[PDB]
Amino acid sequence: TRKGIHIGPGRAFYATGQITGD
């Protein structure tokens, strides 16, 4: 479930990560 972070319309967002690695 848990959860979250809504990217609303026309709002930029930046991740990469992924804190556990690739």
């Epitope: 959860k3 809504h6 609303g8 990469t16």
Partner: antibody
Framework: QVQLQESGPGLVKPSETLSLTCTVS????????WSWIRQPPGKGLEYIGY???????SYNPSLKSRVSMSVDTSRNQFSLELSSVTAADTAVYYC?????????????????????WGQGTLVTVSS | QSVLTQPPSVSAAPGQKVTISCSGS????????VSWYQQHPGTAPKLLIY???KRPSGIPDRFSGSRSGTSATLGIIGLQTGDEAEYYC??????????FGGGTKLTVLS
């Protein structure tokens, strides 16, 4: 303000690859996920997939084996590749900017979205 | 039948309340936020509602949506002529895609 524009062939022979490019202006590709969504005439809308500005993708599971998307930061363009097309791929094809829920889980971007659309381009599949 | 279900058709008299219903399941609406689209034929789809009930600016109140349970509903008050179009709902579905309802044709009773 920010405007997207579909481009590519209008007629395509079955079994060949369909290609299209969405061209964006007034804003950067950066920081957004972007999508192609098609519409067979008189039918409703089917989402094909999305691509993240940095290049990561996610393709509708029904088309995944046939579909391919790519993003070109420099040209400010992104693009679609439908393979081995048939009668069923005849549609108006729209490109779009997305929005939705993000998860740090591993499920990443959940697309609920599309606030920005091109005008769409009709593509006819025929021999 | 589709993952999301809408009524193929809905009608009301210029000036009347109407309501379009999007119907789904735990797999989708129980877990993601729906959005709403007006489509006039020959033009692209245009975003009416997002996040169940938020309204992008430029959209008239009188356009309102909401979610309850695994269902969602678009409501159009004070009907007009330019309101005649096809309306879609959409969300993420557990099947791993954005999904649209079949599309409700709203006819304003001339």
């Amino acid at each position: 303000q920010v405007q997207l524009q579909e481009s590519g062939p209008g007629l395509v022979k079955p079994s060949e690859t369909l290609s299209l490019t969405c061209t964006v202006s007034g804003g950067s590709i950066s920081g957004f996920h972007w999508s192609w969504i098609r519409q067979p005439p008189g039918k409703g809308l089917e989402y094909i997939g999305y691509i993240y500005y940095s290049g990561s993708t996610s393709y509708n599971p029904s088309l995944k084996s046939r579909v391919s998307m790519s993003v070109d930061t420099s040209r400010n363009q992104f693009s679609l590749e439908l393979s081995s097309v048939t009668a069923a791929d005849t549609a108006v094809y729209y490109c779009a900017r997305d929005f939705g829920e993000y998860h740090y889980d591993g499920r990443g971007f959940q697309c609920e979205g599309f606030d920005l659309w091109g005008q769409g381009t009709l593509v006819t599949v025929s021999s | 039948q589709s993952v999301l279900t809408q009524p193929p058709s809905v009608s009301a008299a210029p000036g009347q309340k109407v309501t379009i219903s999007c119907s789904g399941s735990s797999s989708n609406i129980g877990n993601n936020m729906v959005s709403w689209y007006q489509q006039h034929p020959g033009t692209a789809p245009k975003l009416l509602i997002y996040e169940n009930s938020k309204r992008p600016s430029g959209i008239p109140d009188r356009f309102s949506g909401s979610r309850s349970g695994t269902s969602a509903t678009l409501g159009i008050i004070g009907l007009q002529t330019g309101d005649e179009a096809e309306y879609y709902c959409a969300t993420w579905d557990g099947s791993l895609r954005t999904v649209f309802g079949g599309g409700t044709k709203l006819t304003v009773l001339s």
